[PDB]
Amino acid sequence: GSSGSSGGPPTRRSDFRVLVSGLPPSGSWQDLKDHMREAGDVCYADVQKDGMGMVEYLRKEDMEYALRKLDDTKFRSHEGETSYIRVYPERSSGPSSG
């Protein structure tokens, strides 16, 4: 596995993901993943400025697992620095009932 394309659209290899916020200024997705992976296998791993991140699992449990297990952890950046990143699901006007 490597993946490498110019385009790189907003694809969702999975549905069960975990929103990470409160990342360091040096924090990366690599280390982040290696961390988030705590759950299971990460098919998606991205990080943005400010201090946010995103990881997608192949299993639901993994999500909840890492969600709780991790639920706010001490992430170490590639610069040694650290920061408290929370692990929570993604919400946005749920359907509830069609």
mmCIF file of N, CA and C in Angstrom:
data_model
loop_
_atom_site.group_PDB
_atom_site.id
_atom_site.type_symbol
_atom_site.label_atom_id
_atom_site.label_comp_id
_atom_site.label_asym_id
_atom_site.label_seq_id
_atom_site.Cartn_x
_atom_site.Cartn_y
_atom_site.Cartn_z
ATOM 1 N N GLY A 1 0.823 -1.197 0.000
ATOM 2 C CA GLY A 1 0.000 0.000 0.000
ATOM 3 C C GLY A 1 0.867 1.261 0.000
ATOM 4 N N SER A 2 0.453 2.225 -0.810
ATOM 5 C CA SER A 2 1.179 3.479 -0.912
ATOM 6 C C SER A 2 0.226 4.605 -1.320
ATOM 7 N N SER A 3 -0.429 4.400 -2.453
ATOM 8 C CA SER A 3 -1.369 5.386 -2.961
ATOM 9 C C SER A 3 -0.637 6.693 -3.275
ATOM 10 N N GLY A 4 -0.907 7.214 -4.463
ATOM 11 C CA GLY A 4 -0.285 8.453 -4.896
ATOM 12 C C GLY A 4 -0.879 8.932 -6.222
ATOM 13 N N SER A 5 -1.690 9.976 -6.128
ATOM 14 C CA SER A 5 -2.327 10.539 -7.306
ATOM 15 C C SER A 5 -2.391 12.062 -7.190
ATOM 16 N N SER A 6 -2.440 12.710 -8.344
ATOM 17 C CA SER A 6 -2.504 14.162 -8.386
ATOM 18 C C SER A 6 -3.850 14.643 -7.840
ATOM 19 N N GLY A 7 -4.912 14.178 -8.481
ATOM 20 C CA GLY A 7 -6.256 14.551 -8.071
ATOM 21 C C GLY A 7 -6.437 14.379 -6.562
ATOM 22 N N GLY A 8 -6.790 13.161 -6.177
ATOM 23 C CA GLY A 8 -6.997 12.852 -4.771
ATOM 24 C C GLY A 8 -8.238 13.566 -4.230
ATOM 25 N N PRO A 9 -9.421 13.114 -4.723
ATOM 26 C CA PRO A 9 -10.682 13.699 -4.299
ATOM 27 C C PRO A 9 -11.053 13.236 -2.888
ATOM 28 N N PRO A 10 -12.131 13.861 -2.343
ATOM 29 C CA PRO A 10 -12.598 13.523 -1.009
ATOM 30 C C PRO A 10 -13.333 12.181 -1.010
ATOM 31 N N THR A 11 -12.548 11.113 -1.071
ATOM 32 C CA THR A 11 -13.110 9.773 -1.080
ATOM 33 C C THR A 11 -13.166 9.210 0.342
ATOM 34 N N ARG A 12 -14.159 8.363 0.571
ATOM 35 C CA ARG A 12 -14.335 7.751 1.876
ATOM 36 C C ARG A 12 -14.224 6.228 1.767
ATOM 37 N N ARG A 13 -12.995 5.747 1.876
ATOM 38 C CA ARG A 13 -12.740 4.319 1.791
ATOM 39 C C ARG A 13 -13.621 3.563 2.788
ATOM 40 N N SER A 14 -14.006 4.268 3.842
ATOM 41 C CA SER A 14 -14.846 3.678 4.870
ATOM 42 C C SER A 14 -15.841 4.717 5.393
ATOM 43 N N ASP A 15 -16.730 4.254 6.260
ATOM 44 C CA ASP A 15 -17.735 5.129 6.839
ATOM 45 C C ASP A 15 -17.364 5.431 8.293
ATOM 46 N N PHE A 16 -16.905 4.396 8.981
ATOM 47 C CA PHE A 16 -16.514 4.537 10.374
ATOM 48 C C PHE A 16 -15.164 5.246 10.494
ATOM 49 N N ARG A 17 -15.227 6.508 10.895
ATOM 50 C CA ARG A 17 -14.022 7.303 11.054
ATOM 51 C C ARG A 17 -13.985 7.938 12.446
ATOM 52 N N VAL A 18 -12.902 8.656 12.706
ATOM 53 C CA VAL A 18 -12.732 9.316 13.989
ATOM 54 C C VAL A 18 -12.137 10.708 13.766
ATOM 55 N N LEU A 19 -12.855 11.709 14.255
ATOM 56 C CA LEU A 19 -12.413 13.086 14.117
ATOM 57 C C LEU A 19 -11.421 13.412 15.236
ATOM 58 N N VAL A 20 -10.260 13.904 14.828
ATOM 59 C CA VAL A 20 -9.223 14.260 15.782
ATOM 60 C C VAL A 20 -9.004 15.774 15.749
ATOM 61 N N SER A 21 -9.054 16.373 16.930
ATOM 62 C CA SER A 21 -8.863 17.808 17.050
ATOM 63 C C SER A 21 -7.935 18.116 18.226
ATOM 64 N N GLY A 22 -7.181 19.194 18.077
ATOM 65 C CA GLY A 22 -6.251 19.608 19.115
ATOM 66 C C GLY A 22 -4.845 19.074 18.836
ATOM 67 N N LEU A 23 -4.541 18.939 17.554
ATOM 68 C CA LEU A 23 -3.240 18.443 17.141
ATOM 69 C C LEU A 23 -2.205 19.562 17.280
ATOM 70 N N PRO A 24 -0.916 19.142 17.394
ATOM 71 C CA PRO A 24 0.172 20.094 17.532
ATOM 72 C C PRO A 24 0.477 20.776 16.197
ATOM 73 N N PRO A 25 1.324 21.837 16.274
ATOM 74 C CA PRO A 25 1.702 22.581 15.084
ATOM 75 C C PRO A 25 2.709 21.794 14.243
ATOM 76 N N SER A 26 3.263 20.759 14.856
ATOM 77 C CA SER A 26 4.237 19.921 14.178
ATOM 78 C C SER A 26 3.650 18.529 13.932
ATOM 79 N N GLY A 27 2.503 18.288 14.549
ATOM 80 C CA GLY A 27 1.830 17.009 14.407
ATOM 81 C C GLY A 27 1.647 16.646 12.932
ATOM 82 N N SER A 28 1.692 15.349 12.665
ATOM 83 C CA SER A 28 1.534 14.859 11.306
ATOM 84 C C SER A 28 0.442 13.787 11.260
ATOM 85 N N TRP A 29 0.246 13.239 10.070
ATOM 86 C CA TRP A 29 -0.758 12.207 9.878
ATOM 87 C C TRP A 29 -0.081 10.848 10.068
ATOM 88 N N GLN A 30 1.194 10.804 9.715
ATOM 89 C CA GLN A 30 1.964 9.577 9.842
ATOM 90 C C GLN A 30 1.931 9.076 11.287
ATOM 91 N N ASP A 31 2.503 9.879 12.171
ATOM 92 C CA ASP A 31 2.546 9.530 13.581
ATOM 93 C C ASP A 31 1.117 9.380 14.108
ATOM 94 N N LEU A 32 0.269 10.314 13.701
ATOM 95 C CA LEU A 32 -1.121 10.297 14.123
ATOM 96 C C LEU A 32 -1.721 8.919 13.833
ATOM 97 N N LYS A 33 -1.544 8.480 12.596
ATOM 98 C CA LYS A 33 -2.059 7.188 12.179
ATOM 99 C C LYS A 33 -1.504 6.100 13.102
ATOM 100 N N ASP A 34 -0.186 5.968 13.080
ATOM 101 C CA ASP A 34 0.480 4.974 13.905
ATOM 102 C C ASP A 34 -0.174 4.946 15.289
ATOM 103 N N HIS A 35 -0.715 6.092 15.676
ATOM 104 C CA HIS A 35 -1.370 6.210 16.967
ATOM 105 C C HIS A 35 -2.814 5.719 16.857
ATOM 106 N N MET A 36 -3.575 6.397 16.010
ATOM 107 C CA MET A 36 -4.968 6.042 15.804
ATOM 108 C C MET A 36 -5.114 4.547 15.512
ATOM 109 N N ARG A 37 -4.174 4.034 14.730
ATOM 110 C CA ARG A 37 -4.186 2.628 14.369
ATOM 111 C C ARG A 37 -4.501 1.768 15.595
ATOM 112 N N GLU A 38 -4.197 2.320 16.760
ATOM 113 C CA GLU A 38 -4.441 1.618 18.008
ATOM 114 C C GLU A 38 -5.669 0.714 17.878
ATOM 115 N N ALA A 39 -6.683 1.241 17.206
ATOM 116 C CA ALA A 39 -7.914 0.497 17.005
ATOM 117 C C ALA A 39 -7.627 -0.728 16.135
ATOM 118 N N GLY A 40 -7.587 -0.493 14.831
ATOM 119 C CA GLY A 40 -7.324 -1.564 13.885
ATOM 120 C C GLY A 40 -6.447 -1.073 12.731
ATOM 121 N N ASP A 41 -7.002 -1.158 11.531
ATOM 122 C CA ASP A 41 -6.286 -0.729 10.343
ATOM 123 C C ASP A 41 -6.882 0.589 9.842
ATOM 124 N N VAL A 42 -5.995 1.517 9.513
ATOM 125 C CA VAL A 42 -6.418 2.816 9.021
ATOM 126 C C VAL A 42 -6.292 2.846 7.497
ATOM 127 N N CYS A 43 -7.427 3.053 6.845
ATOM 128 C CA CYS A 43 -7.456 3.106 5.393
ATOM 129 C C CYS A 43 -7.290 4.566 4.962
ATOM 130 N N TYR A 44 -7.668 5.461 5.862
ATOM 131 C CA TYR A 44 -7.566 6.885 5.588
ATOM 132 C C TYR A 44 -6.886 7.619 6.746
ATOM 133 N N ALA A 45 -5.986 8.522 6.386
ATOM 134 C CA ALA A 45 -5.262 9.295 7.380
ATOM 135 C C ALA A 45 -4.861 10.644 6.778
ATOM 136 N N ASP A 46 -5.479 11.695 7.299
ATOM 137 C CA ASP A 46 -5.197 13.038 6.825
ATOM 138 C C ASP A 46 -5.138 13.994 8.017
ATOM 139 N N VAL A 47 -4.381 15.067 7.839
ATOM 140 C CA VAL A 47 -4.233 16.061 8.888
ATOM 141 C C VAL A 47 -4.197 17.456 8.262
ATOM 142 N N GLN A 48 -4.792 18.404 8.971
ATOM 143 C CA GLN A 48 -4.835 19.777 8.498
ATOM 144 C C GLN A 48 -4.249 20.720 9.550
ATOM 145 N N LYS A 49 -4.055 21.965 9.141
ATOM 146 C CA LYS A 49 -3.504 22.969 10.035
ATOM 147 C C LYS A 49 -4.437 23.146 11.234
ATOM 148 N N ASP A 50 -4.130 24.153 12.039
ATOM 149 C CA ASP A 50 -4.930 24.439 13.218
ATOM 150 C C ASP A 50 -4.653 23.380 14.286
ATOM 151 N N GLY A 51 -4.928 22.135 13.925
ATOM 152 C CA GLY A 51 -4.713 21.026 14.840
ATOM 153 C C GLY A 51 -5.838 19.995 14.723
ATOM 154 N N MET A 52 -6.182 19.680 13.484
ATOM 155 C CA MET A 52 -7.236 18.713 13.223
ATOM 156 C C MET A 52 -6.702 17.522 12.425
ATOM 157 N N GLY A 53 -7.453 16.432 12.475
ATOM 158 C CA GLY A 53 -7.069 15.225 11.765
ATOM 159 C C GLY A 53 -8.294 14.367 11.438
ATOM 160 N N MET A 54 -8.051 13.315 10.670
ATOM 161 C CA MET A 54 -9.121 12.412 10.279
ATOM 162 C C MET A 54 -8.573 11.021 9.956
ATOM 163 N N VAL A 55 -9.243 10.016 10.499
ATOM 164 C CA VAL A 55 -8.836 8.638 10.277
ATOM 165 C C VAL A 55 -10.078 7.772 10.059
ATOM 166 N N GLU A 56 -9.951 6.832 9.134
ATOM 167 C CA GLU A 56 -11.050 5.935 8.822
ATOM 168 C C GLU A 56 -10.630 4.481 9.046
ATOM 169 N N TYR A 57 -11.516 3.736 9.689
ATOM 170 C CA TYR A 57 -11.250 2.336 9.971
ATOM 171 C C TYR A 57 -12.044 1.426 9.032
ATOM 172 N N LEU A 58 -11.691 0.150 9.057
ATOM 173 C CA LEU A 58 -12.360 -0.829 8.216
ATOM 174 C C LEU A 58 -13.445 -1.537 9.030
ATOM 175 N N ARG A 59 -13.327 -1.418 10.344
ATOM 176 C CA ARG A 59 -14.287 -2.038 11.240
ATOM 177 C C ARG A 59 -14.937 -0.982 12.138
ATOM 178 N N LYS A 60 -16.206 -1.208 12.440
ATOM 179 C CA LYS A 60 -16.949 -0.288 13.284
ATOM 180 C C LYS A 60 -16.315 -0.253 14.677
ATOM 181 N N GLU A 61 -16.200 -1.434 15.268
ATOM 182 C CA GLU A 61 -15.615 -1.552 16.593
ATOM 183 C C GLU A 61 -14.366 -0.675 16.703
ATOM 184 N N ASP A 62 -13.479 -0.839 15.732
ATOM 185 C CA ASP A 62 -12.245 -0.073 15.708
ATOM 186 C C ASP A 62 -12.552 1.389 16.039
ATOM 187 N N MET A 63 -13.515 1.938 15.312
ATOM 188 C CA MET A 63 -13.912 3.320 15.517
ATOM 189 C C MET A 63 -14.214 3.591 16.992
ATOM 190 N N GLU A 64 -15.281 2.967 17.469
ATOM 191 C CA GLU A 64 -15.689 3.132 18.854
ATOM 192 C C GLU A 64 -14.521 2.816 19.791
ATOM 193 N N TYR A 65 -13.858 1.704 19.505
ATOM 194 C CA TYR A 65 -12.726 1.280 20.311
ATOM 195 C C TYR A 65 -11.729 2.425 20.501
ATOM 196 N N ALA A 66 -11.119 2.825 19.394
ATOM 197 C CA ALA A 66 -10.147 3.904 19.425
ATOM 198 C C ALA A 66 -10.804 5.162 19.996
ATOM 199 N N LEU A 67 -12.061 5.354 19.626
ATOM 200 C CA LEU A 67 -12.812 6.509 20.092
ATOM 201 C C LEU A 67 -12.697 6.603 21.615
ATOM 202 N N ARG A 68 -13.124 5.537 22.276
ATOM 203 C CA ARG A 68 -13.076 5.488 23.728
ATOM 204 C C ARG A 68 -11.632 5.316 24.205
ATOM 205 N N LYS A 69 -11.072 4.158 23.888
ATOM 206 C CA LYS A 69 -9.705 3.857 24.277
ATOM 207 C C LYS A 69 -8.867 5.135 24.210
ATOM 208 N N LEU A 70 -8.788 5.690 23.009
ATOM 209 C CA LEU A 70 -8.025 6.908 22.797
ATOM 210 C C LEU A 70 -8.693 8.061 23.550
ATOM 211 N N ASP A 71 -9.923 8.350 23.153
ATOM 212 C CA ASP A 71 -10.679 9.422 23.780
ATOM 213 C C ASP A 71 -9.718 10.342 24.536
ATOM 214 N N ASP A 72 -9.210 11.334 23.818
ATOM 215 C CA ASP A 72 -8.284 12.286 24.406
ATOM 216 C C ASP A 72 -7.005 11.555 24.824
ATOM 217 N N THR A 73 -5.951 11.788 24.056
ATOM 218 C CA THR A 73 -4.670 11.162 24.334
ATOM 219 C C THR A 73 -3.529 12.150 24.092
ATOM 220 N N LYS A 74 -2.338 11.745 24.509
ATOM 221 C CA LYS A 74 -1.162 12.583 24.344
ATOM 222 C C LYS A 74 -0.426 12.174 23.066
ATOM 223 N N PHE A 75 -0.666 12.942 22.012
ATOM 224 C CA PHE A 75 -0.036 12.672 20.731
ATOM 225 C C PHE A 75 1.304 13.401 20.616
ATOM 226 N N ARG A 76 2.323 12.643 20.238
ATOM 227 C CA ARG A 76 3.656 13.201 20.087
ATOM 228 C C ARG A 76 3.939 13.508 18.615
ATOM 229 N N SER A 77 4.231 14.773 18.353
ATOM 230 C CA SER A 77 4.522 15.208 16.998
ATOM 231 C C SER A 77 5.903 14.704 16.571
ATOM 232 N N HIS A 78 6.257 15.020 15.335
ATOM 233 C CA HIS A 78 7.541 14.607 14.795
ATOM 234 C C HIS A 78 8.639 15.537 15.315
ATOM 235 N N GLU A 79 8.207 16.579 16.011
ATOM 236 C CA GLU A 79 9.139 17.546 16.567
ATOM 237 C C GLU A 79 9.289 17.334 18.074
ATOM 238 N N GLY A 80 8.784 16.198 18.533
ATOM 239 C CA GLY A 80 8.854 15.865 19.945
ATOM 240 C C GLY A 80 7.652 16.430 20.703
ATOM 241 N N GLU A 81 7.298 17.658 20.355
ATOM 242 C CA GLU A 81 6.174 18.322 20.992
ATOM 243 C C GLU A 81 4.996 17.354 21.133
ATOM 244 N N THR A 82 4.042 17.750 21.962
ATOM 245 C CA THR A 82 2.864 16.931 22.192
ATOM 246 C C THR A 82 1.618 17.811 22.314
ATOM 247 N N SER A 83 0.465 17.163 22.232
ATOM 248 C CA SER A 83 -0.800 17.872 22.331
ATOM 249 C C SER A 83 -1.928 16.887 22.643
ATOM 250 N N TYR A 84 -2.970 17.410 23.273
ATOM 251 C CA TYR A 84 -4.115 16.592 23.634
ATOM 252 C C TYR A 84 -5.149 16.567 22.506
ATOM 253 N N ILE A 85 -5.215 15.429 21.831
ATOM 254 C CA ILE A 85 -6.152 15.264 20.733
ATOM 255 C C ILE A 85 -7.305 14.365 21.183
ATOM 256 N N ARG A 86 -8.516 14.846 20.944
ATOM 257 C CA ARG A 86 -9.705 14.100 21.319
ATOM 258 C C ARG A 86 -10.153 13.203 20.163
ATOM 259 N N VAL A 87 -10.804 12.107 20.526
ATOM 260 C CA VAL A 87 -11.289 11.162 19.534
ATOM 261 C C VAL A 87 -12.814 11.074 19.623
ATOM 262 N N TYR A 88 -13.465 11.538 18.566
ATOM 263 C CA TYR A 88 -14.916 11.517 18.513
ATOM 264 C C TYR A 88 -15.409 11.251 17.088
ATOM 265 N N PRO A 89 -16.684 10.788 16.998
ATOM 266 C CA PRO A 89 -17.283 10.492 15.709
ATOM 267 C C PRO A 89 -17.663 11.778 14.972
ATOM 268 N N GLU A 90 -18.182 11.600 13.766
ATOM 269 C CA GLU A 90 -18.589 12.732 12.952
ATOM 270 C C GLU A 90 -20.115 12.847 12.925
ATOM 271 N N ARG A 91 -20.597 14.004 13.354
ATOM 272 C CA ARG A 91 -22.028 14.254 13.384
ATOM 273 C C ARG A 91 -22.375 15.462 12.512
ATOM 274 N N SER A 92 -23.590 15.443 11.986
ATOM 275 C CA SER A 92 -24.055 16.526 11.138
ATOM 276 C C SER A 92 -25.509 16.283 10.726
ATOM 277 N N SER A 93 -26.414 16.883 11.483
ATOM 278 C CA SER A 93 -27.834 16.740 11.210
ATOM 279 C C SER A 93 -28.146 15.296 10.810
ATOM 280 N N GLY A 94 -28.242 14.444 11.821
ATOM 281 C CA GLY A 94 -28.535 13.039 11.590
ATOM 282 C C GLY A 94 -29.935 12.861 10.998
ATOM 283 N N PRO A 95 -30.137 11.685 10.346
ATOM 284 C CA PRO A 95 -31.420 11.380 9.734
ATOM 285 C C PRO A 95 -32.459 11.013 10.795
ATOM 286 N N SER A 96 -32.049 10.139 11.702
ATOM 287 C CA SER A 96 -32.932 9.698 12.769
ATOM 288 C C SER A 96 -34.017 8.780 12.204
ATOM 289 N N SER A 97 -34.788 9.328 11.276
ATOM 290 C CA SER A 97 -35.860 8.572 10.652
ATOM 291 C C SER A 97 -36.247 9.216 9.319
ATOM 292 N N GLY A 98 -36.332 8.378 8.296
ATOM 293 C CA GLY A 98 -36.690 8.851 6.970
ATOM 294 C C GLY A 98 -38.210 8.939 6.811
#
